[PDB]
């Protein structure tokens, strides 16, 4: 089924998406959160102007984040808790990892960057 073959091969307590500039779900898995269109453009604002989030928090499915050090223009990194949020721009899509302990930081920003890596070798 797709979602058997969404949930193995992104990250599935974590959840992972591929979302369009635009905002639509190109996949998603099961537990991946209903996010609001304005959240969708202040993201593809900070890819603009790295640090524009940061007096604000990120905020994804009205949950808010403490952004930190991510990669200017291609990662967004944000903490909450025992867990965060990665989000890796890339042509045509954005790929976004949620994780909670005992899901790790570095498990999360892995599997979105193999996801990033896959689309962006695709051409999008």
């Known amino acids: 089924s797709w979602q058997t073959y969404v949930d193995e091969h992104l990250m599935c307590l974590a959840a992972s998406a591929i979302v369009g500039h635009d905002g639509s779900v190109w996949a998603q898995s ?5 996010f609001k269109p304005q959240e969708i453009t202040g993201i593809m604002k900070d890819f603009e102007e790295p640090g524009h989030l940061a007096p604000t928090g990120l905020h994804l499915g009205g949950i808010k ?19 965060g ?15 909670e302990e005992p899901v790790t930081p570095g498990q999360c920003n ?9 689309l962006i070798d695709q051409g999008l």
């Open 110 to 118: 892995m599997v979105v960057e193999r996801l990033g890596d896959y």
């Open 30 to 34: 099961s537990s991946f959160p209903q």
């Open 65 to 83: 984040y403490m952004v930190i050090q991510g990669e200017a223009g291609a990662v967004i990194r944000g903490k909450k808790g025992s867990g």
């Open 85 to 99: 949020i990665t989000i890796k721009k890339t042509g045509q899509a954005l790929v976004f990892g949620i994780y």
